[PDB]
Amino acid sequence: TYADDSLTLHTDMYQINMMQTYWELGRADLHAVFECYFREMPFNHGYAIFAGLERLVNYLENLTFTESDIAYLREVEEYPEDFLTYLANFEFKCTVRSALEGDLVFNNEPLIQIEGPLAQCQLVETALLNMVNFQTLIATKAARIKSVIGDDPLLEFGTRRAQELDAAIWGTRAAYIGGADATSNVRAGKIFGIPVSGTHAHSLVQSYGNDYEAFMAYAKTHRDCVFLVDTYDTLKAGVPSAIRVAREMGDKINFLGVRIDSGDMAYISKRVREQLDEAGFTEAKIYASNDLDENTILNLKMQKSKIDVWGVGTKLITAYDQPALGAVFKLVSIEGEDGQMKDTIKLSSNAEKVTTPGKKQVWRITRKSDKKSEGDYVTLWNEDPRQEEEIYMFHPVHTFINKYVRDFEARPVLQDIFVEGKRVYELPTLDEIKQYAKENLDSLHEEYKRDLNPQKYPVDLSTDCWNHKMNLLEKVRKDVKH
Amino acid sequence: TYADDSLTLHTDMYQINMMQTYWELGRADLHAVFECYFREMPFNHGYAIFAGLERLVNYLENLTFTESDIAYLREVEEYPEDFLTYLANFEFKCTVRSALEGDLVFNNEPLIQIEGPLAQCQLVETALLNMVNFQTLIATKAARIKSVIGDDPLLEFGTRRAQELDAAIWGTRAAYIGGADATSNVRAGKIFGIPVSGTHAHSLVQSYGNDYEAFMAYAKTHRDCVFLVDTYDTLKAGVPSAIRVAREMGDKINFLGVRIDSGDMAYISKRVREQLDEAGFTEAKIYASNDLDENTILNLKMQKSKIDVWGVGTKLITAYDQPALGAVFKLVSIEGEDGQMKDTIKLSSNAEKVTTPGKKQVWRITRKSDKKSEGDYVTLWNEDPRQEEEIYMFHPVHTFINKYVRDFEARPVLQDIFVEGKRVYELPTLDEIKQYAKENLDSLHEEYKRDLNPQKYPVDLSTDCWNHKMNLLEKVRKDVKH
Ligand SMILES: O=C(O)c1cccnc1
Ligand SMILES: O=C(O)c1cccnc1
Ligand SMILES: O=C(O)c1cccnc1
Ligand SMILES: O=C(O)c1cccnc1
């Protein structure tokens, strides 16, 4: 009762009830456009890193209602056989346009756009949000942390702290995309090809009862040695014992260094560095793992801590300070009775809290001469900035802040992934995604990617797109006048 | 590269490297006891609700290294064939004792205990933590929220906001255990048998362009009608239109009520109640869904909001204010050279931040006469309070706070689940778990389960258990004297 063989019902019940309402009344194949976007920059970071495309692609390619799916809906929920045969025959026939994994993405712009039969668009929203919200959030958190670390290793060590198992594997993949250098999760190494990393735990040390014997046991059985030194006493017990083992084993091991999981690291690591150096191990590194995030790491570095490798657990994999992105999936255009597409709106008070209507594209604008970031320019589908000598970029709320831009490149961010349910996009390798992310981040102007108080990245609606929104808003507010 | 057919490598790499170190040196089958516990009450709640046992059981029953598992370890990580054949032949042979799902659980007491070969115990820690940390956390969050709501429905609606897909399905199951009445997640209904619930979305309304036509379309195609009224204007558009549809359809539908997803609900819901009542729909309910948690819900109720049903999204399913439980899995006893078990310790400064050593049991103490909660009493394995006329319960830090207890019942909390890898525990149905949770909560003394400033539930170490800890701590601190 019943077999977990399918993600097709990983959705909100109200989607199936709406699909029924559409289908019974002959409106399931009305033409719709839906868009996915978030409203606020996560962590107030200067940029976000998109993740979730490979996950979504696999989901959409397997989007059929299984025998057990239908049996549940028939036997428990008592849907009629007519509707059920519609669901049995269902195959995905929407166009999907998306940012690619590793793209920089920002608030108030479409990141994924689904276009096709209303009922099919409706089915996919919940699962897409579930996967994209989380994966983008962790990729951005890892970028945030990696930015503060610099070139030194960031190791994603948070599986034990993650919000169930998918979170651990797909989160760690997203972390690698966003800036982690390795994972602890062996299975994520297996299935994604992420480099895998480890040291040892206190349990090894306690199994012997002293540091020397445990470090020796590890040295006898492994080439690459990082010794965890704080089981009993970092300075008096662990570090001297690590040094003793390193001396006795010589070049038969790599003494990569020592891990410290406790204490005030801004004092502890400084004295440990001295101990290693005075013993002649001036290349042995100090690995830290306790309570790390972009804030404590930045402080530790600025205090002149001597830490070379950062194993980050809880705060990265759960995005602990803001554990949800707040992406939403909204209907922006729908086929009217006359067969023509109509811009659709929901009212709020804050006219910026209102979803911008219309089928849109996002154009990343840069200065041709030196590739300077000029911001994103969000158009209706019928505008192509590439054919315009000059564009008018204004802030959508603060419209008195504005510039005419000439001599620019405009790159369309939403790419075809499926056309009418047919995949036209070849999935990159994970390393290619990570390289793509690095290059995109490297190209972003320093002001938008700096760690402290980044400049706000413009996301501007075209004159036409903005006028369409405000005219529709005006029209509905006046319709609600009576 | 390679097939995701297995959870056996869903672990930290350092576990496999330790298993190798144990195995090569003939110590893999040393006898070990490991215990899982958390240090702080999540959300500062008065109690926690344990979840994760069914999940763990399924994991442990399938704990074999697959062909693709071994191929990864051979081809990528280059482990030796000897060790690999050990892993190929691996079968789980540990005893597992656990709290049951729906048990009340507290900080600083073992909740799961694994006993058997050191190398096997080591393998399972990471996955167990991943699943139990999250599921217990969400079950407790749901209890917390449900406590503030009272008898009215709590609906878990957060799939779209969850941290990837496992989080959504297993989180929603945990929410049902802890106090939710239904889920939106259809797949969780399918595979777990949770009651499933829904209304409709704004997209239905926008597909028509007005409330009346969309509410009518929904009424023509469904018996149970909840109309979402805030697409355009709750008071002027949606609620009058819902009322019109209700009037026109009469007893051909159930007009269950109206959903409001926006506005100040403490004003909005009061006026909506008036509108429904004045129209003669004094049984139609008001459903709220926006930005809900135990805090905003409590405030809304205390402001005399007229809300009857609570659809909770982000803050429940992600445990947003504290998205990790902080459970850890620690070696407490290990076979020594002489073949006898030895209490094992790791030093910290705070002697309460030190893991209590020894194989332990947790006894829930109640007064026989009226079943009053007296707290938990954590013993070494060789003490059975049931055979003692009187027990001495003292606070482990504040030892001057203490009582002798007579005429008590002592119930052992850790139950046999696997004996030497063999399942002796029959899995309850989800409804039986939820009933068990309800009854356990109902039996907890009011002071420990009250919403505001609950009394701290005693978790006391027996005289023997406490003396063992402090003597070992003293011994190691004096060993570190030189
Ligand atoms: O390899 C390690 O040191 C490690 C990995 C995950 C969690 N804690 C430690
Ligand atoms: O902040 C913006 O959106 C902006 C800034 C400069 C010029 N145009 C728009
Ligand atoms: O059924 C609903 O009303 C619902 C379910 C999940 C998320 N939002 C709304
Ligand atoms: O808080 C405690 O642990 C406690 C309270 C009363 C008596 N004994 C212990």
One-character DSSP codes across B87-152: HHT-----EEEEPPTT-EE-TTS-SEEEEEEHHHHHHHHHHHHHHHHHHHHHHHHHHHHHHHHTTS
Task: Tell if the CB–CB gap between A164 and B314 is shorter than 8 Å.
Answer: no
CB-based contact B211:B243 (threshold 8 Å) = no
CB-based contact B186:A12 (threshold 8 Å) = yes
Cα–Cα distances (Å) from A234 to A206, B33, B352, in that order, read: 14, 25, 19
Angle at A366 between CA A365 and CA A369, to 5 degrees: 150
CB-based contact A386:A378 (threshold 8 Å) = no
What does the alpha-carbon distance between residue B436 and residue B365 come to, in Å, rounded to a whole number? Answer: 18
Name the nearest CA neighbour of A405 among A388, A381, A380, A384: A388
For A262, other C-beta atoms within 10 Å of its C-beta total 20
What does the alpha-carbon distance between residue B162 and residue B169 come to, in Å, rounded to a whole number? Answer: 9
Instruction: Return residues 344-373 of B near A (CB < 8 Å).
Output: 344-348
Which is it for strands A360-367 and A373-380: parallel, antiparallel or unpaired?
antiparallel
Residue spans of alpha helices (H) in B160-201? 164-178, 186-192
Name the nearest CA neighbour of B162 among A267, A205, A11, A438: A11
Contact A333 CB / ligand 1 (< 6 Å): no
Contact B402 CB / ligand 4 (< 6 Å): yes
Q: Residues B443, B448, B449, B450: is their CA dihedral positive or negative?
A: positive
Contacts of B347 in chain A (CB under 8 A): 231-233
Burial status of residue A264 (CB atoms within 10 A of its CB: 0-12, 13-18, 19 or more): exposed
Q: Could you tell me the domains of chain A?
A: 1-149+318-482 (3.20.140.10), 150-317 (3.20.20.70)
CA of A107 to the centre of ligand 2 (A): 14
- CB proximity list for B87: less than 8 A, separation 6 or greater: B19, B65, B69, B70, B73, B79
Technique used: X-ray
What does the alpha-carbon distance between residue B18 and residue A200 come to, in Å, rounded to a whole number? Answer: 7
Name the nearest CA neighbour of B111 among B151, B56, B185: B56
- CB proximity list for A264: less than 8 A, separation 6 or greater: none
CB-based contact B339:B27 (threshold 8 Å) = no
Task: Tell if the CB–CB gap between A199 and B14 is shorter than 8 Å.
Answer: yes
What does the alpha-carbon distance between residue A203 and residue A327 come to, in Å, rounded to a whole number? Answer: 41
Contacts of B234 in chain A (CB under 8 A): none
- B354 dihedral zone (left: phi>0; alpha: psi -120 to 50; beta): beta
Task: Tell if the CB–CB gap between A122 and B203 is shorter than 8 Å.
Answer: yes
- Cβ burial A314-349 (10 Å sphere, 16+ → b, else e): bbbbbbbebbbbebbbbbbbbbeeeeebbbbbbbee
- The token pair at B249 is 């359809």
Name the nearest CA neighbour of B76 among A253, A180, A189: A189
Residue in the block written with tokens 């499933």: B196
Cα–Cα distances (Å) from A343 to A334, B231, B360, in that order, read: 7, 14, 65
For A351, other C-beta atoms within 10 Å of its C-beta total 14
Q: HSE of A420 in the Cβ direction (CA atoms, 13 Å)?
A: 1
Interface test with B, best of A1, A33, A163 (most B CBs within 10 A): A163
- CB proximity list for B332: less than 8 A, separation 6 or greater: B33, B34, B35, B343, B344, B355, B356, B357, B358, B359, B360
- The token pair at B219 is 């009424």
- CB proximity list for B2: less than 8 A, separation 6 or greater: A190, A191, B68, B71, B72
Q: Note the residue count of chain A.
A: 482
CB-based contact B288:B307 (threshold 8 Å) = yes
What does the alpha-carbon distance between residue A395 and residue A376 come to, in Å, rounded to a whole number? Answer: 11
Residue type, A63: L
CB-based contact B178:B141 (threshold 8 Å) = yes
Q: Which atom belonging to ligand 1 lies closest to the Cα atom of A157?
A: 6
What does the alpha-carbon distance between residue A278 and residue A257 come to, in Å, rounded to a whole number? Answer: 14
Q: How far is CA B348 from the centre of its chain?
A: 28
Q: In this structure, what is the dihedral angle of CA atoms B285, B286, B292, B297, given to the nearest 10 degrees?
A: -80
What does the alpha-carbon distance between residue B60 and residue B133 come to, in Å, rounded to a whole number? Answer: 17
CB-based contact A430:A194 (threshold 8 Å) = yes
Instruction: Return residues 75-94 of B near A (CB < 8 Å).
Output: 76-77
Instruction: Return residues 261-280 of B near A (CB < 8 Å).
Output: 262
- The token pair at A323 is 């554990």
Helix (H, G, I), strand (E, B) or coil at A177: helix
Q: After which residues is chain B broken (C to N over 2.5 A)?
A: none
- CB proximity list for A480: less than 8 A, separation 6 or greater: A347, B232, B233, B236, B237
Cα–Cα distances (Å) from A26 to A116, A119, A181, B148, B392, in that order, read: 15, 11, 52, 44, 73
- The token pair at A367 is 């200065």
Task: Tell if the CB–CB gap between A334 and B190 is shorter than 8 Å.
Answer: no
CB-based contact B289:B261 (threshold 8 Å) = yes
- The alpha carbon of residue A405 is apart from the nearest alpha carbon of chain B, in Å, by 36
Backbone angles phi, psi at B347, to 5 degrees: -75, 135
Q: What is the DSSP letter of A213?
A: H
- Cβ burial A358-379 (10 Å sphere, 16+ → b, else e): bbbbbbbbbeeeeeebbbbbbb
What does the alpha-carbon distance between residue B113 and residue B95 come to, in Å, rounded to a whole number? Answer: 8
What does the alpha-carbon distance between residue B257 and residue B199 come to, in Å, rounded to a whole number? Answer: 10
In DSSP terms, A226 is beta-bridged to A257
- The alpha carbon of residue B371 is apart from the nearest alpha carbon of chain A, in Å, by 36
Backbone angles phi, psi at A391, to 5 degrees: -120, 150
Cα–Cα distances (Å) from B441 to A163, A285, A436, in that order, read: 25, 50, 52
CB-based contact A131:A59 (threshold 8 Å) = yes
What does the alpha-carbon distance between residue B114 and residue B420 come to, in Å, rounded to a whole number? Answer: 10
What does the alpha-carbon distance between residue B146 and residue B149 come to, in Å, rounded to a whole number? Answer: 5
Contacts of B166 in chain A (CB under 8 A): 164-167
CA of A458 to the centre of ligand 2 (A): 5
Residue type, A384: D
Residue type, A347: L
| Minimal-distance CA residue of chain B relative to A335 | B207
Cα–Cα distances (Å) from A25 to A89, A306, A331, B247, B408, in that order, read: 18, 68, 19, 21, 66
Return the residue whose CA atom lies nearest to atom 1 of ligand 4.
Answer: B458
- CB proximity list for B451: less than 8 A, separation 6 or greater: B147, B148, B294, B298
Helix (H, G, I), strand (E, B) or coil at B412: strand
Residue in the block written with tokens 């056309």: A419
Q: What is the resolution of this structure in A?
A: 2.0
Return the residue whose CA atom lies nearest to atom 5 of ligand 1.
Answer: A157
- The token pair at B382 is 């060789």
CB-based contact A294:A302 (threshold 8 Å) = no
Contacts of B344 in chain A (CB under 8 A): 206-207, 209
- CB proximity list for A307: less than 8 A, separation 6 or greater: A265, A269, A286, A287, A288, A300, A301
| Minimal-distance CA residue of chain A relative to B134 | A163
- CB proximity list for B347: less than 8 A, separation 6 or greater: A231, A232, A233, B354, B473, B476, B477, B480
Q: In this structure, what is the dihedral angle of CA atoms B403, B406, B407, B412, given to the nearest 10 degrees?
A: 70
Chain B CB within 8 Å of residue A66 CB: no
H/E stretch holding B34: strand B31-38
Which is it for strands A285-288 and A390-394: parallel, antiparallel or unpaired?
unpaired
**Which ligand is closest to the CA of A375, given by its number?**
2
Which is it for strands B254-260 and B285-288: parallel, antiparallel or unpaired?
parallel
Chain B CB within 8 Å of residue A58 CB: no
Helices (runs of H) and strands (runs of E) counted in chain A: 16, 21
Contact A17 CB / ligand 3 (< 6 Å): no
For B39-93, where are the E strands, in sequence order?
A: 48-49
Helix (H, G, I), strand (E, B) or coil at B458: coil
Residues with CB under 6 A from ligand 2: A 393-395, 401-403, 456, 458, 460
Which is it for strands A182-183 and A327-335: parallel, antiparallel or unpaired?
unpaired
Contact B412 CB / ligand 3 (< 6 Å): no
Helices (runs of H) and strands (runs of E) counted in chain B: 16, 21
Burial status of residue A415 (CB atoms within 10 A of its CB: 0-12, 13-18, 19 or more): middle
- The token pair at A321 is 């300070």
Name the nearest CA neighbour of B132 among A161, A130, A170: A161
What does the alpha-carbon distance between residue A147 and residue A295 come to, in Å, rounded to a whole number? Answer: 11
Return the residue whose CA atom lies nearest to atom 7 of ligand 4.
Answer: B402
H/E stretch holding A301: helix A294-302
What does the alpha-carbon distance between residue B321 and residue A279 come to, in Å, rounded to a whole number? Answer: 46
To the nearest 10 degrees (0 to 180), the angle between helices B81-88 and B13-24 is 110
What does the alpha-carbon distance between residue A357 and residue A361 come to, in Å, rounded to a whole number? Answer: 12
Name the nearest CA neighbour of A436 among A50, A42, A37: A50
Task: Tell if the CB–CB gap between B185 and A479 is shorter than 8 Å.
Answer: no
For B236, other C-beta atoms within 10 Å of its C-beta total 12
Per-position DSSP letters for A381-418, written without gaps between them: TT--GGG-SEEEEE-SSSTTSEEEEESEEEEE--EEEE
Task: Tell if the CB–CB gap between B72 and A190 is shorter than 8 Å.
Answer: yes
Residue type, B243: I
Cα–Cα distances (Å) from B348 to A234, A269, A300, A312, B477, in that order, read: 11, 17, 21, 21, 10
CA of A188 to the centre of ligand 3 (A): 32
H/E stretch holding A56: helix A53-61
Q: Which atom belonging to ligand 3 lies closest to the Cα atom of B157?
A: 6
Q: What is the DSSP letter of B309?
A: E
Instruction: Return residues 396-455 of B near A (CB < 8 Å).
Output: none
CA of A397 to the centre of ligand 2 (A): 10
Starting at the edge strand that comes first in sequence, how are the strands of the sheet with B408-412 ordered? B408-412, B360-367, B373-380, B459-461
What does the alpha-carbon distance between residue A445 and residue B12 come to, in Å, rounded to a whole number? Answer: 37
Name the nearest CA neighbour of A240 among A265, A263, A214, A212: A212
Q: How far is CA B434 from the centre of its chain?
A: 12
- Cβ burial B260-294 (10 Å sphere, 16+ → b, else e): bbbbebbebbbebbebbeebebeebbbbbbeebbb
Task: Tell if the CB–CB gap between A160 and B130 is shorter than 8 Å.
Answer: yes
